[PDB]
């Protein structure tokens, strides 16, 4: 089973600044990593699939990058609507696993 | 349409249906087996081509008994199709050579 | 649209079972897998299992105690998860998601809040909160409403049936002797009240109750 | 039963016996060689198919001299069988084309 | 030769509670891991083969999970008959090796 480590757990940035969330996989998964946003009492929402590919609906503000074991979601110019919990998830090997998650905090 | 060209063509269509059924069935067979990489439809389709041609890179392979049984049908459809094209080409050349010898 | 449709809540007694549902709409291919994800309060997401309705073939998370049994009814485009012999470890929100077989959850349900308790279902009492007669207002004015004595969670509080988005807080419930209580706050330009009407609407899915309550100045 | 279809069939049965003997003998050859993965009968059988078809994914392979000698016999039985089916198909098509030309 | 590390060596749980024993492999072995129970002066007894597959004879209480290098035997609702020594064993690569073992203790 693959282990998605998201450190740190909370991330404090100032309004308008660039923010980066890390996901490390326990073994190489290519780019088979996807990111979800969960606001207070919302459902998760696909933001990025396959590490860097955009979902339409999603501010261009959101990017992702990475390959092998090291993955990063970036929000360039954090705004208040970004306050949420961010999760990574792998589809490289059965079963699908999630990250522990990261709270963004302005 | 001679037999050999109808057969060659039939084998081409049938190989395409086997690549697709095999992609579907491999994913179905492989999910539930921890560590299995053969578990989404797009790369399963890549896997089925790579197996049917016998290139077999090994980036992907089935690890379950039913994944492996499916893989055996893809290998054999692929080797037989491509062998049935070679045999149809051999049938063309032999006829041409007879006609040329004046036979 | 809404692609996955889940009930908002079920109460279940310790040792009882429950059958969660998920009605899909939009494009429903043969290739599609339905997934179930479990989020315990203030915890992260846990993959619980997957079913392919076309073949009815189902896989489970084997890293945890097996409580789930996944079934699909292809006629009524509906996925079911039977959760049996539940303790309080099993109290959580359970989402269904749709994966097209390329490995990511495109579309989620709103999730079903499953409370495992021996308590009983109580609809909320709803109470206006207009300001006291001795309070100097400004360019804005804060009204609210008081949802108390409900079980189980959750409740849904809207302001004028959804049309009032800006200015709204709803506070988290507290738990007193087997009953929950929260408050919601709204803040409107003082001119626009009470000339223009302000109503809190309060659904409680576990009891099928939805009450409106108007906020008038105090008699 | 023409020769070519009897031979094709004979080669199919014989390939199945070689897959089985080869599975058995590879395991026997490979246990005792530290790091060897080719060491239980069920995946040895998978290995023998993957070698005989020439897909050769490389999830499994023999690392001993006798494992490798066994593997060479499986490769050659497999290439010859599948070549003997191609040759039998070519014999069918040529006959049909003669009959059609009116020959 | 593959190295099966079982930590911790002793595991103290209360009656009725869930217990997990870890086996880490020195290199990836797929699911080619099997677990044995040995009671005081008994022979070992197959409990789980291939990481998660059940042996008939064995309380449904016993489960296993894991893939690559990280494996786990679980007993949901430990009872007194479970007091024993638990060993893991790999069949991925020659030769077969055992874990050092873990005493369960109520």
DSSP string, C9-42: EEEE-TT--EEEEEEE-S---SS-EEEEEEE-TT
CB contact under 8 A, C63 and E76: no
Indicate the length of chain D as a whole number. Answer: 103
Q: Which chains touch C (3 or more CB pairs under 8 A)?
A: A, B, E
**Is the CB of residue E31 less than 8 Å away from at least one CB of chain D?**
no
- Are C155 and C203 in contact by the 8 Å Cβ rule? The answer is yes
- Are C52 and B41 in contact by the 8 Å Cβ rule? The answer is no
Torsions phi, psi of E26, nearest 5?
A: -70, -15
Chain A residues with CB-CB distance to B34 below 8 A = 1, 93-95
**Is the CB of residue B34 less than 8 Å away from at least one CB of chain E?**
yes
Chain breaks after residues in chain E, where C lies over 2.5 Å from next N? none
Q: Which chains touch E (3 or more CB pairs under 8 A)?
A: A, B, C, D
Place of tokens 């014999």: D91
Chain E residues with CB-CB distance to B35 below 8 A = 30-31, 67-68
d(CA C42, CA D41): 49
DSSP classification of residue E43: P
CB contact under 8 A, D39 and E1: no
CB contact under 8 A, B39 and A94: yes
Torsions phi, psi of C16, nearest 5?
A: -75, 165
Place of tokens 């999760």: A87
d(CA C159, CA C145): 10
Establish, for the pair of chains C and E, how many residue pairs have beta carbons separated by less than 8 Å: 11
- Are B65 and B97 in contact by the 8 Å Cβ rule? The answer is no
For chain D, what is the domain count?
A: 1
Chain C residues with CB-CB distance to A98 below 8 A = 37, 44-47
d(CA B63, CA D57): 12
Closest in C35, C44, C63 to A101, CB measured: C44
**Is the CB of residue C17 less than 8 Å away from at least one CB of chain E?**
no
Cα torsion E14, E16, E17, E21: sign: positive
Query: Residue B1's domain spans which residues?
Result: 1-103
Burial class of C45 by CB neighbour count within 10 A (0 to 12, 13 to 18, 19+): buried
Q: How many CB atoms lie within 10 A of CB B53?
A: 15
**Is the CB of residue C8 less than 8 Å away from at least one CB of chain A?**
no
CB contact under 8 A, B24 and C31: yes
CB < 8 Å & 24+ apart, contacts of A69-73: A69/A24, A69/A25, A69/A26, A69/A27, A69/A28, A69/A29, A70/A22, A70/A24, A71/A22, A71/A23, A71/A24, A71/A25, A71/A33, A72/A20, A72/A21, A72/A22, A72/A23, A73/A20, A73/A21, A73/A23, A73/A35, A73/A47, A73/A48
- For C118-164, the DSSP string reads SS--BPPEEEEEPPPTT----SEEEEEEEEEEEBSS--EEEETTTT-
With vertex at residue C45, the alpha carbon angle to CA C44 and CA C51, rounded to the nearest 5 degrees, is 170
Structure tokens at C30: 């043969």
Cα distance from E94 to chain C (closest Cα, Å)?
Answer: 28
Structure tokens at D20: 């089985």
Torsions phi, psi of D87, nearest 5?
A: -65, -35
- Are A38 and A85 in contact by the 8 Å Cβ rule? The answer is yes
Nearest chain A residue (CA) to C154: A41
- For B8-73, the DSSP string reads HHHHHHHHHHHHHHHHHHHHHHHTTSTT----SHHHHHHHHHHHHTT---SSS---SHHHHHHHHH
With vertex at residue C118, the alpha carbon angle to CA C116 and CA C121, rounded to the nearest 5 degrees, is 85
Cα distance from B61 to chain E (closest Cα, Å)?
Answer: 13
The CATH number of residue E98's host domain is 2.60.40.10
Give the residue from C190, C186, C195, C117 showing the smallest Cα distance to C157.
C186
Q: What is the CA radius of gyration of chain C?
A: 21
**Is the CB of residue B47 less than 8 Å away from at least one CB of chain D?**
no
Indicate the length of chain B as a whole number. Answer: 103
Q: C-alpha distances in angstroms, C157 versus A88, C185, C202, D59?
A: 31, 10, 5, 57
**Is the CB of residue A1 less than 8 Å away from at least one CB of chain E?**
yes
CB contact under 8 A, C62 and E52: yes
Structure tokens at B21: 């059924």
* Method in brief: X-ray
Q: How many CB atoms lie within 10 A of CB C18?
A: 20
d(CA A50, CA B28): 22
Q: How many CB atoms lie within 10 A of CB D101?
A: 11
Give the residue from C125, C121, C129 showing the smallest Cα distance to C159.
C129
Nearest chain B residue (CA) to E66: B34
Cα torsion B22, B24, B29, B33: sign: positive
d(CA B51, CA B25): 14
Which residues, at least 6 apart from C69, have a Cβ–Cβ distance to it below 8 Å? C58, C81, C82, C84
Burial class of B21 by CB neighbour count within 10 A (0 to 12, 13 to 18, 19+): middle
**Is the CB of residue D102 less than 8 Å away from at least one CB of chain B?**
no
CB contact under 8 A, E66 and B63: no
Q: C-alpha distances in angstroms, A97 versus A88, C63, C115, C131?
A: 9, 11, 25, 50
**Is the CB of residue D32 less than 8 Å away from at least one CB of chain E?**
yes
Cα distance from B83 to chain D (closest Cα, Å)?
Answer: 5
Q: C-alpha distances in angstroms, C103 versus B41, C30, C33, C81, C97?
A: 9, 15, 10, 21, 11
- For A48-82, the DSSP string reads EETTTEEPTTS-TTEEEEEETTEEEEEEES--GGG
**Is the CB of residue A64 less than 8 Å away from at least one CB of chain C?**
no
d(CA C108, CA C37): 10
Specified resolution (Å): 2.8
Q: What is the CA radius of gyration of chain D?
A: 18
β-strand pairing of C107-108 with A10-12: unpaired
DSSP classification of residue D58: S
Which residues, at least 6 apart from C176, have a Cβ–Cβ distance to it below 8 Å? none
Torsions phi, psi of E41, nearest 5?
A: 65, 25
Q: Are D and C close enough to touch, i.e. 3+ CB pairs under 8 angstroms? A: no
Beta bridge partners of E12: E105
Which residues, at least 6 apart from E58, have a Cβ–Cβ distance to it below 8 Å? E47, E48
3-state helix, strand, coil in chain E (%, to 5): 5, 50, 50
Give the residue from C83, C85, C93 showing the smallest Cα distance to C40.
C93
Which residues, at least 6 apart from D61, have a Cβ–Cβ distance to it below 8 Å? D37, D38, D47, D71
Cα torsion B32, B37, B43, B46: sign: negative
**Is the CB of residue C31 less than 8 Å away from at least one CB of chain B?**
yes
Give the residue from C168, C197, C193 showing the smallest Cα distance to C182.
C168
Torsions phi, psi of B74, nearest 5?
A: -65, -45
Structure tokens at C168: 């709204």
d(CA B31, CA A96): 10
Q: C-alpha distances in angstroms, B5 versus B8, C3, C84, E85, E97?
A: 5, 48, 60, 68, 57
Chain C residues with CB-CB distance to A36 below 8 A = 45, 105
Closest in B58, B72, B88 to D93, CB measured: B88
Which residues, at least 6 apart from E57, have a Cβ–Cβ distance to it below 8 Å? none
> Which domains does chain C show, CATH number per domain?
4-116 (2.60.40.10), 125-214 (2.60.40.10)
Query: Residue A100's domain spans which residues?
Result: 4-106
- Are C152 and C206 in contact by the 8 Å Cβ rule? The answer is yes
């Amino acid at each position: 089973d693959i282990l998605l480590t998201q450190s740190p757990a909370i991330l404090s940035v100032s309004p308008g600044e660039r923010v980066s969330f890390s996901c490390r996989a326990s073994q190489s998964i290519g780019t088979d990593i996807h990111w979800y946003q969960q606001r207070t009492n919302g459902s998760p929402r696909l933001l990025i699939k396959y590490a860097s590919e955009s979902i339409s609906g999603i501010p261009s503000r959101f990017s992702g990058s990475g390959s092998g074991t090291d993955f990063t979601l970036s929000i360039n110019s954090v705004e208040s609507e970004d306050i949420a919990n961010y999760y990574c998830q792998q589809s490289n090997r059965w079963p699908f696993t999630f990250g522990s998650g990261t709270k963004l905090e302005i | 349409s001679a037999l050999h060209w109808r057969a060659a063509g039939a084998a081409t269509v049938l190989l395409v249906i086997v690549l697709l059924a095999g992609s579907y069935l491999a994913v179905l067979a492989e999910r539930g087996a921890p560590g299995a990489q053969l578990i989404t439809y797009p790369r399963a389709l890549w896997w089925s081509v790579v197996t049917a041609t016998t290139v077999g890179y090994g980036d992907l392979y089935p690890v379950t008994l039913w994944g492996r049984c499916v893989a055996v049908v893809v290998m054999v459809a692929g080797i037989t199709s491509f062998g049935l094209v070679t045999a149809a080409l051999a049938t063309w050349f032999v006829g041409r050579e007879q006609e040329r010898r004046g036979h | 649209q809404v692609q996955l449709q889940q009930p908002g809540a079920e109460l279940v007694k310790p040792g009882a079972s429950v059958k969660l549902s998920c009605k899909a709409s939009g494009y429903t291919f043969t290739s599609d897998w339905i997934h179930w994800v479990k989020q315990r309060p203030g915890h992260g997401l846990e993959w619980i299992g997957e079913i392919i309705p076309s073949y009815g073939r189902a896989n489970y998370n084997e890293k945890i105690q097996k409580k789930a049994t996944l079934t699909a009814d292809k006629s009524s485009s509906t996925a079911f998860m039977q959760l049996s012999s539940l303790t309080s470890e099993d109290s959580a929100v359970y989402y269904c998601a749709r994966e097209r077989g390329d490995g990511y959850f495109a579309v989620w349900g709103a999730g079903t809040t499953v409370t495992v308790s021996s308590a009983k279902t109580t609809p909320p009492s709803v109470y206006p909160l207009a300001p006291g007669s001795a309070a100097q207002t400004n360019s804005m004015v804060t009204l609210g409403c008081l949802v108390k004595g409900y079980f189980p969670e959750p409740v849904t509080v809207t302001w004028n049936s959804g049309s009032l988005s800006s200015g709204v807080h709803t506070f988290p419930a507290v738990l007193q002797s087997d009953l929950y209580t929260l408050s919601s706050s709204v803040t409107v330009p003082s001119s626009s009240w009470p000339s223009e009407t302000v109503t809190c609407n309060v659904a409680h899915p576990a009891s099928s109750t939805k009450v409106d309550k108007k906020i008038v100045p105090r008699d």
